[PDB]
Tab-separated table of C-alpha atoms and ligand atoms in Angstrom:
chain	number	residue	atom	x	y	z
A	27	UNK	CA	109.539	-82.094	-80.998
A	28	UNK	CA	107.050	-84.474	-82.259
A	29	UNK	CA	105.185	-86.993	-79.712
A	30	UNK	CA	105.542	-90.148	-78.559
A	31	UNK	CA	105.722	-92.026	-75.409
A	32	UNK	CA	108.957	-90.779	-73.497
A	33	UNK	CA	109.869	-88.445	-70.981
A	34	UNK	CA	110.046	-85.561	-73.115
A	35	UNK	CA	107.177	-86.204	-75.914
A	36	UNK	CA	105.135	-88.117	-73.625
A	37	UNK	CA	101.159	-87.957	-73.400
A	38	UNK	CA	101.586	-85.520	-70.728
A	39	UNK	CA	103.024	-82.968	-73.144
A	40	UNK	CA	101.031	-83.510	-75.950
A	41	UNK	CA	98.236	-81.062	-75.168
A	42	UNK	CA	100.841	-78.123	-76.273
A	43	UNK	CA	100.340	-79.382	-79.532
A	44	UNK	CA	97.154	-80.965	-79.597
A	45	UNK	CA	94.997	-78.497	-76.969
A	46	UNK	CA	92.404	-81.693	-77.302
A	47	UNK	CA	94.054	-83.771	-75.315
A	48	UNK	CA	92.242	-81.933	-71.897
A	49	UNK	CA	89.079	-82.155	-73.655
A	50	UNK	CA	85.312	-83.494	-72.759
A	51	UNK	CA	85.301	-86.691	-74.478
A	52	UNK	CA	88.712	-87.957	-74.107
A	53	UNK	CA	89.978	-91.664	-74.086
A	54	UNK	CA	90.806	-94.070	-72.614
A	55	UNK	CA	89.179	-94.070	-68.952
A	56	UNK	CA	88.889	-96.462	-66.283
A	57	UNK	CA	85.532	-98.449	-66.534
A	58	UNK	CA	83.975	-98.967	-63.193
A	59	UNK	CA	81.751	-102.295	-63.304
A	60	UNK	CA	79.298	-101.450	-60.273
A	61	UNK	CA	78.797	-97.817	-61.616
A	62	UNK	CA	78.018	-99.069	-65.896
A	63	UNK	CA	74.467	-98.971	-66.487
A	64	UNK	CA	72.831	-102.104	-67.897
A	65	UNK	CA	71.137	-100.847	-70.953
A	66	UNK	CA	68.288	-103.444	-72.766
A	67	UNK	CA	67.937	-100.841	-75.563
A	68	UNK	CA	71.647	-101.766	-76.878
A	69	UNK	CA	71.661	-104.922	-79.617
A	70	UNK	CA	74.104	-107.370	-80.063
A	71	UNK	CA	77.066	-106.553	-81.784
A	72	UNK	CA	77.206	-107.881	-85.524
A	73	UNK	CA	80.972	-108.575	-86.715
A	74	UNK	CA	81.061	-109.494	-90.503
A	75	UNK	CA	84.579	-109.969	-91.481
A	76	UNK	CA	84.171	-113.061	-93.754
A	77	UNK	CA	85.175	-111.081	-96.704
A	78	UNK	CA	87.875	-109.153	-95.079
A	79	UNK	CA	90.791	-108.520	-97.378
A	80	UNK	CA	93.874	-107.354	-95.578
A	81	UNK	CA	96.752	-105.798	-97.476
A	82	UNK	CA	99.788	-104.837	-95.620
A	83	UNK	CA	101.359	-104.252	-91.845
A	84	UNK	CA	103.194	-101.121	-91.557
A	85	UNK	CA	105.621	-100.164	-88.568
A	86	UNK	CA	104.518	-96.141	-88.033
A	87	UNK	CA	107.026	-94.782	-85.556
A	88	UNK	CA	104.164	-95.840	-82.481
A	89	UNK	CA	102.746	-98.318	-83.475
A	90	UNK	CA	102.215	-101.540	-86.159
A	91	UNK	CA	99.014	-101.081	-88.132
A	92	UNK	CA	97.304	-104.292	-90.339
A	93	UNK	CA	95.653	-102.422	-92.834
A	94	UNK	CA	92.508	-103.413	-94.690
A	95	UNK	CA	90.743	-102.311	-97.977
A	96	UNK	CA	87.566	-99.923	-97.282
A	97	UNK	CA	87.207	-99.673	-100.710
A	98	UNK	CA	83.669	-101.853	-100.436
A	99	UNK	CA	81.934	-103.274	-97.289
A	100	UNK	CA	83.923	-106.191	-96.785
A	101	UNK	CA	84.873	-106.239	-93.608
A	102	UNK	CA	82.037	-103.837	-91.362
A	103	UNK	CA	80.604	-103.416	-87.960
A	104	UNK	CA	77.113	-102.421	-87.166
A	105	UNK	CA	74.314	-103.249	-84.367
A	106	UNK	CA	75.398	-102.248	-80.483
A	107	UNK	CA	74.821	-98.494	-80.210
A	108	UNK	CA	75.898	-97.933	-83.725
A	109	UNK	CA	73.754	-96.778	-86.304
A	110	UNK	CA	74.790	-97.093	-90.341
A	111	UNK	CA	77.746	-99.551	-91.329
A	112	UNK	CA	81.436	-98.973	-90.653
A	113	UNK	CA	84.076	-100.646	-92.816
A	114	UNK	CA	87.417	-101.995	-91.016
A	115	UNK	CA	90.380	-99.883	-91.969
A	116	UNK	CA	93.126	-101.000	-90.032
A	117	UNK	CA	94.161	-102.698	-86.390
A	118	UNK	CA	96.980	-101.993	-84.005
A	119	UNK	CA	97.920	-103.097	-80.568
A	120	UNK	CA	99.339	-101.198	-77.543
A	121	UNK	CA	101.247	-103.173	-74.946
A	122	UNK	CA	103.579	-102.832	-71.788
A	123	UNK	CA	107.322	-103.194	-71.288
A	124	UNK	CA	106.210	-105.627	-68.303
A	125	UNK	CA	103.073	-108.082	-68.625
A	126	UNK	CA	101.479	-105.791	-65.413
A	127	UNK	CA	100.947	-103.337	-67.751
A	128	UNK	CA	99.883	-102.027	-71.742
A	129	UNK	CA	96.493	-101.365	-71.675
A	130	UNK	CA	94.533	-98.427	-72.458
A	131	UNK	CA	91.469	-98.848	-71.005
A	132	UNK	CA	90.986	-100.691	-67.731
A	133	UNK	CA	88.949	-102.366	-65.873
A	134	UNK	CA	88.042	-101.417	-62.017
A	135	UNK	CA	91.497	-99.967	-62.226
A	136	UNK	CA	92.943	-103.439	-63.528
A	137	UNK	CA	95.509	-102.903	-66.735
A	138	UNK	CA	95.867	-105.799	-68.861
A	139	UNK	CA	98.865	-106.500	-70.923
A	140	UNK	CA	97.887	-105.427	-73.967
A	141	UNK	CA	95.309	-103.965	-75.950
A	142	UNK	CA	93.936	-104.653	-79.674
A	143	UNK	CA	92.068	-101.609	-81.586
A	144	UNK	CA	89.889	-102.608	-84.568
A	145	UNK	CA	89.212	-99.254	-86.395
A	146	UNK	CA	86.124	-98.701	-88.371
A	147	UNK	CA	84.439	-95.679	-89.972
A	148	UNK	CA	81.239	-94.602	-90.692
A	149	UNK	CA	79.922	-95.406	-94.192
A	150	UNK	CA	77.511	-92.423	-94.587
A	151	UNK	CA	80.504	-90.130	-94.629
A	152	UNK	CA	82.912	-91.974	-97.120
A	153	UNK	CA	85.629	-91.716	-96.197
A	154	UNK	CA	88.087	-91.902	-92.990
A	155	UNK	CA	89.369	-88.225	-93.839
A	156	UNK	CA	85.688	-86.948	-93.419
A	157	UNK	CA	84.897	-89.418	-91.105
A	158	UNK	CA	87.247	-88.465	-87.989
A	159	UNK	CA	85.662	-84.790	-88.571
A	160	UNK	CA	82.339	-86.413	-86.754
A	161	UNK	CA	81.015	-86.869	-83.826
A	162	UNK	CA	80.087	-90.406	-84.975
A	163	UNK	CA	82.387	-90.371	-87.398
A	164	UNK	CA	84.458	-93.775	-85.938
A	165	UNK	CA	83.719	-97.662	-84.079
A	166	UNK	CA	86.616	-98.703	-82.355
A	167	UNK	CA	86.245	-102.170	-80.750
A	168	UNK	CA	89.060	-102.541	-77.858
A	169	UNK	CA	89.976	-105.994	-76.680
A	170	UNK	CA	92.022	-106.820	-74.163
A	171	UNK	CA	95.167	-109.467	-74.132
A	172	UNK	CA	95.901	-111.479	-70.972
A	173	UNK	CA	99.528	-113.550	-70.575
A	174	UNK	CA	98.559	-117.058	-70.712
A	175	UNK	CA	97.873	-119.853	-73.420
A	176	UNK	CA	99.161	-118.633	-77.309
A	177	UNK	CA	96.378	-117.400	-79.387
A	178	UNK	CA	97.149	-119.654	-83.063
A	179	UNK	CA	95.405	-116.620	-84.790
A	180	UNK	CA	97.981	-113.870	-84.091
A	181	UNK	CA	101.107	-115.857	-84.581
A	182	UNK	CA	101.237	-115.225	-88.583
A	183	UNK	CA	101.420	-111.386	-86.851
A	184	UNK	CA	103.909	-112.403	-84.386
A	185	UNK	CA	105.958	-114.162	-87.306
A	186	UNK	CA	106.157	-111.062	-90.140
A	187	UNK	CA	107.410	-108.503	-86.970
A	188	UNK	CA	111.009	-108.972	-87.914
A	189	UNK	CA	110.959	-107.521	-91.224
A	190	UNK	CA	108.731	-104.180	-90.047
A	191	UNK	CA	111.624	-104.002	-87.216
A	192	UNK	CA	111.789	-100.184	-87.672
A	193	UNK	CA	109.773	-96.960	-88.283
A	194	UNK	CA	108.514	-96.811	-91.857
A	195	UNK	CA	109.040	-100.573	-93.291
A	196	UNK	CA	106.139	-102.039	-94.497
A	197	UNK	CA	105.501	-105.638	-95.646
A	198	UNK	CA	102.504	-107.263	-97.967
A	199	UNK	CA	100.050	-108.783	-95.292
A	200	UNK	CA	97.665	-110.587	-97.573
A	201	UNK	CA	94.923	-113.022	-96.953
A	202	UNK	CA	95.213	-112.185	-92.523
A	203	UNK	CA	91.882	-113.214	-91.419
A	204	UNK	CA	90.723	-110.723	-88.411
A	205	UNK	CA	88.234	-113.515	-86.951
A	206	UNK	CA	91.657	-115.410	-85.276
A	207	UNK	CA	91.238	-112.575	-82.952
A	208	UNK	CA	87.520	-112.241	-81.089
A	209	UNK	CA	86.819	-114.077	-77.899
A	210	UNK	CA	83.967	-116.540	-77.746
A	211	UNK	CA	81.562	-113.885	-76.228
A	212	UNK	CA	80.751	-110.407	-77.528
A	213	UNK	CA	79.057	-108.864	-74.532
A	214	UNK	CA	80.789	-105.087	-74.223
A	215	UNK	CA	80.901	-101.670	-72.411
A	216	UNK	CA	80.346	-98.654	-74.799
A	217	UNK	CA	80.905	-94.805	-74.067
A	218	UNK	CA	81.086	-92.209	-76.709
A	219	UNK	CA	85.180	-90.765	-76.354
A	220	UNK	CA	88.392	-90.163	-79.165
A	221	UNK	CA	91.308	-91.524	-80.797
A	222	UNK	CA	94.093	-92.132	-78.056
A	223	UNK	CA	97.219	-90.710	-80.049
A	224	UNK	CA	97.205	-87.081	-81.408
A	225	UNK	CA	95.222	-85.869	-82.978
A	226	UNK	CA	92.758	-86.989	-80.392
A	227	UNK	CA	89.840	-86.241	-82.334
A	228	UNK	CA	86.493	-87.091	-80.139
A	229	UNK	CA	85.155	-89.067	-83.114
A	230	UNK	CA	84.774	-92.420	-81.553
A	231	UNK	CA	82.224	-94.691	-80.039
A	232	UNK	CA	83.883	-97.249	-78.265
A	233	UNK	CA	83.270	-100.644	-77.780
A	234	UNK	CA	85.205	-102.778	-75.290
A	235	UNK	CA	84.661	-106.326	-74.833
A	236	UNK	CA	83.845	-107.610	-71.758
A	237	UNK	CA	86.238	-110.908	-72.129
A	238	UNK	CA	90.044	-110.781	-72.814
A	239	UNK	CA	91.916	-113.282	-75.201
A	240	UNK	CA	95.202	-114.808	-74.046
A	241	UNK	CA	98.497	-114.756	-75.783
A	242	UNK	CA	101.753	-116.731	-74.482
A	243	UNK	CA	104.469	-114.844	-73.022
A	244	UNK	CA	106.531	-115.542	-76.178
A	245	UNK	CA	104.306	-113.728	-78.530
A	246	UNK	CA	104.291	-110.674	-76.355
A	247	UNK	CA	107.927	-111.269	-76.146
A	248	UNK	CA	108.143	-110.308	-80.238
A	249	UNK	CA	106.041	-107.114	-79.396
A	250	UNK	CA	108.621	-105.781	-77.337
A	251	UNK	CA	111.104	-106.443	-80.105
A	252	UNK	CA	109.877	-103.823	-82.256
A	253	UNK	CA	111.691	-100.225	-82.522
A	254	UNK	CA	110.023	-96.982	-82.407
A	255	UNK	CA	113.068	-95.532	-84.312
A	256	UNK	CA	114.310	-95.819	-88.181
A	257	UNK	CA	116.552	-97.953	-89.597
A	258	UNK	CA	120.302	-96.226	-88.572
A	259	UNK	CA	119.320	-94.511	-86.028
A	260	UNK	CA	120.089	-95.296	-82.413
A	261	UNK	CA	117.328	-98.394	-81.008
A	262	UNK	CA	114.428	-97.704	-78.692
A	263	UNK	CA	112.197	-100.295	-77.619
A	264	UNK	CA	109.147	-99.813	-79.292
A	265	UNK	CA	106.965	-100.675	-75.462
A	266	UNK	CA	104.810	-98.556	-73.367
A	267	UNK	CA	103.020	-96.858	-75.913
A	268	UNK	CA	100.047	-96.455	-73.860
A	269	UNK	CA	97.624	-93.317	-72.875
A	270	UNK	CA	96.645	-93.504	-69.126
A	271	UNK	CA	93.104	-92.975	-68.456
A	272	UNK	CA	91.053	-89.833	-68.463
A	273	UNK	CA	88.495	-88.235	-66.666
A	274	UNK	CA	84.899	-89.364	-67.109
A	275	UNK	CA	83.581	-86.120	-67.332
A	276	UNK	CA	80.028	-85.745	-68.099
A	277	UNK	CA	79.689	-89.470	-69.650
A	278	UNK	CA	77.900	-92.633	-69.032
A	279	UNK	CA	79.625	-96.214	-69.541
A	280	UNK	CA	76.532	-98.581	-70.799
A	281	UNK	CA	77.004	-102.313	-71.084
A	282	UNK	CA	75.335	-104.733	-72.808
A	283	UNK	CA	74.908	-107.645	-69.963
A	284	UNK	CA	74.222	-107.567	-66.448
B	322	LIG	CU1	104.312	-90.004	-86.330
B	323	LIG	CU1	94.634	-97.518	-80.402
């Protein structure tokens, strides 16, 4: 029936639907620190979300999305390996049923317990629609969460959770400031790969921060809370909604520090 993340739906199944998902360019992988190249060539990363104007958080069915207007460049991305400006359309998180567990991407083989998507899209094509259609269509910057000290800036997240308890509630998320959410240091791994849930379109140039933030046990606690079904209808844990990793394939992992 349609995917997901159990036994029957799973991300082993979904190539039936979506014949992508055994593709070149497919993400996440495992990123092997002795085998990254150092690349000078790459430029720091250049975050401007001063002006960023979020609008609402919507529970899809997989996930929680904080979405953003892309109707100007308020919030955008450029420098690294990109080239034009991407606008910030939404965020989302995936995370573990246990704290051993929930991210996408990992680190010599390490998983982390949960990992934060920022999702930007190309300017010169505008708009996300066209966008994913493109090889550089997308910028997602992954960062990972570790179980440890609370992060202040996610808690007015944490706290609005309750009322998107199921799939398809929405609530007005106005005036969320994305900043509350970068570590101190923007040094990163990038690899060109795709979206991790179907449609798996190999439209994205990753970035992944080298350095994780923490979050307290309690605010991964309220994660967990969340329900992948509707209102009325019998309650799964929305947890574990996670892609393993993926063959490398003919790619290169560059980083930005040595
Ligand atoms: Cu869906
Ligand atoms: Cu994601």
């Amino acid at each position: 029936h349609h995917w997901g993340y159990g036994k029957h739906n799973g991300p082993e199944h979904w190539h039936k639907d979506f014949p992508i998902a055994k593709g070149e360019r497919q993400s996440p992988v495992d990123i092997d620190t002795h085998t990254a190249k150092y690349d000078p060539s790459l430029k720091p990363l250049s975050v401007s979300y001063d002006q960023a104007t979020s609008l609402r958080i919507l529970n899809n069915g997989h996930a929680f999305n904080v979405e953003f207007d892309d109707s100007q460049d308020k919030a955008v991305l450029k420098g690294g390996p990109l080239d034009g400006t991407y606008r910030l359309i939404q965020f989302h998180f995936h995370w573990g049923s246990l704290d051993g567990q929930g991210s996408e991407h990992t680190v010599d083989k390490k998983k982390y317990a949960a990992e934060l998507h920022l999702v930007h899209w190309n300017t010169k094509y505008g708009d996300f629609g066209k966008a994913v259609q493109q090889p550089d269509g997308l910028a997602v910057l992954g960062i990972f969460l570790k179980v440890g000290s609370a992060k202040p800036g996610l808690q007015k997240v944490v706290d609005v959770l309750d009322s998107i308890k199921t799939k398809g509630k929405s609530a007005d998320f106005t005036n969320f400031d994305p900043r509350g959410l970068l570590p101190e240091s923007l040094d990163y791994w990038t690899y060109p790969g795709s979206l991790t849930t179907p449609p798996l379109l190999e439209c994205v140039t990753w970035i992944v921060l080298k350095e994780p933030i923490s979050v307290s046990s309690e605010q991964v606690l309220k994660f967990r809370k969340l329900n992948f079904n509707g209102e009325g209808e019998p309650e799964e844990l929305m947890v574990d909604n996670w892609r393993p990793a993926q063959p490398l394939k003919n790619r290169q992992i560059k980083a930005s520090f040595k």
